[PDB]
Amino acid sequence: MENFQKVEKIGEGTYGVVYKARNKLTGEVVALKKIRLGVPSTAIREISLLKELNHPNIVKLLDVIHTENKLYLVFEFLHQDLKKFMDASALTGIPLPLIKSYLFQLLQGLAFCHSHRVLHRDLKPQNLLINTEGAIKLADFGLARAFGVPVTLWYRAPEILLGCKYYSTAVDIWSLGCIFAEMVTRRALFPGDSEIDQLFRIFRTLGTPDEVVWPGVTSMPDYKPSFPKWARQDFSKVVPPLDEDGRSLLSQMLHYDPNKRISAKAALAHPFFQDVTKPVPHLRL
Ligand SMILES: C[C@@H](O)[C@@H](C)Oc1nc(Nc2ccc([S@](=N)(=O)C3CC3)cc2)ncc1Br
């Protein structure tokens, strides 16, 4: 920490506080994360593995600093998050080709991390970071598991909400699916204020799941036979004015059954991405 000069606080939550900071002697400008507490050894090993994990759509973890029995993480700094960018574009909306770029790259990031069996688990607009060049990257990949972390529910896959202890990479596709739809419509897709309300907002839109669409669902830990039975709605109603290609890909990203939910790899090949390009955004910094 004495090697770093804090500039401003840019975030807070699970893992504590995040600062924009300058390395007092290199001059490099970084994002510094102080982890919230010595540090268990399994957490050190796992975070060390994450440092290896380099890809253009993943926020580079530059340095792990474990000292005075605290853990600091030093990340590359990007200048804006997707939430602020969505708020600033709320009057016009983000152009579809930039949405498509951002989705494509984000699926590239997941594909990569998933091929290394690394899971995000807590995707949200504040974890997705952009630059002036038209790139977008995922921040905090693998932190949940490295740290054994057990509040925004809005992007939570139904299998987590119904009490699956052993969930898969499919939980990140679900989240990214809810973010895709939010970019398109300019409203959060499932804005739950509690876990049951989150679940029930999902059921009211996609239909109450059952054994036919999701084998095994009724035996899940927090499944209750007393759940109300709502009928599924048309995506044409959910995400106007996304085209049929985009709606087809979204529904596959929002399959109830995690084994039927599209992989990031397969999603990259979806016809929605046939005319993808890489626009640059208008960022006001
Ligand atoms: C993912 C989340 O904890 C974050 C904190 O981490 C990072 N944040 C950033 N940069 C950054 C994040 C937010 C904003 S913002 N849209 O202006 C916010 C309203 C103030 C600007 C830059 N760069 C690497 C990391 Br890692």
For atom 24 of ligand 1, the residue with the nearest CA is 77
In the sheet with 61-67, reading across from the earlier edge strand, the strands are: 4-13, 16-23, 29-34, 70-76, 61-67
**Domain enclosing residue 148, as ranges:** 80-283
For residues 182 and 258, membership in a common domain is answered with: yes
For residues 114 and 203, membership in a common domain is answered with: yes
Residue 119 half-sphere exposure toward CB, CA atoms < 13 A: 18
Residues assigned a catalytic role: 122
User: Residue 191, preceding bond cis, omega within 30 degrees?
Assistant: no
The secondary structure of the chain in percent helix, strand, coil, rounded to multiples of 5, reads 35, 15, 45
For atom 2 of ligand 1, the residue with the nearest CA is 127
Looking at 44, 59, 79, the residue that finishes a domain is: 79
Q: Which one-letter DSSP state was computed for residue 232? A: P
For atom 20 of ligand 1, the residue with the nearest CA is 10
Q: What is the resolution of this structure in A?
A: 2.0
For residues 258 and 187, membership in a common domain is answered with: yes
For residues 7 and 49, membership in a common domain is answered with: yes
114 touches 169 (CB < 8 A): yes
Q: List residues near ligand 1 (CB under 6 A).
A: 10-11, 18, 31, 59, 75, 77-81, 84, 126-127, 129, 139-140
Residue 45 neighbours by CB under 8 Å, 6+ apart: none
Report d(CA 242, CA 247) in Å as an integer. 6
Q: Which two tokens stand for residue 241?
A: 């004015």
The CA-based angle 57-105-257, given to 5 degrees, is 105
For residues 270 and 191, membership in a common domain is answered with: yes
Instruction: Specify the number of domains making up the chain.
Output: 2
82 touches 129 (CB < 8 A): yes
SS in 3 state form for 144-180? HHHCCCCCCCCCCCHHHHCCCCCCCCHHHHHHHHHHH
Nearest ligand 1 atom, CA 128:
1
Structure obtained using = X-ray
Burial 67-102 (b: 16+ CB within 10 A, else e): eeeebbbbbbbbebbbeebbeebeeeebeeebbbbb
Instruction: For residue 149, report the distance from its CA to the centre of ligand 1, in Å.
Output: 20
Q: Phi-psi category of 27—alpha, beta or left, where left has phi over 0 and alpha has psi -120 to 50?
A: left
For residues 11 and 94, membership in a common domain is answered with: no
For residues 151 and 178, membership in a common domain is answered with: yes
For residues 123 and 209, membership in a common domain is answered with: yes
For residues 146 and 28, membership in a common domain is answered with: no
CATH code of the domain containing 244: 1.10.510.10
Instruction: For residue 79, report the distance from its CA to the centre of ligand 1, in Å.
Output: 7
Looking at 45, 79, 113, the residue that finishes a domain is: 79
Nearest Cα neighbor of 104 from 32, 180, 161, 38 is 180
Write phi, then psi, for 240 (nearest 5 degrees): -65, 140
In single-letter form, the type of residue at position 159 comes to E
Q: 70 forms bridges with which residues in the sheet?
A: 67
For residues 68 and 120, membership in a common domain is answered with: no
Looking at 79, 104, 134, the residue that finishes a domain is: 79
In testing the pocket of ligand 1, which one of 7, 18, 35, 83 has its CB within 8 Å of the most ligand atoms? 18
65 touches 72 (CB < 8 A): yes
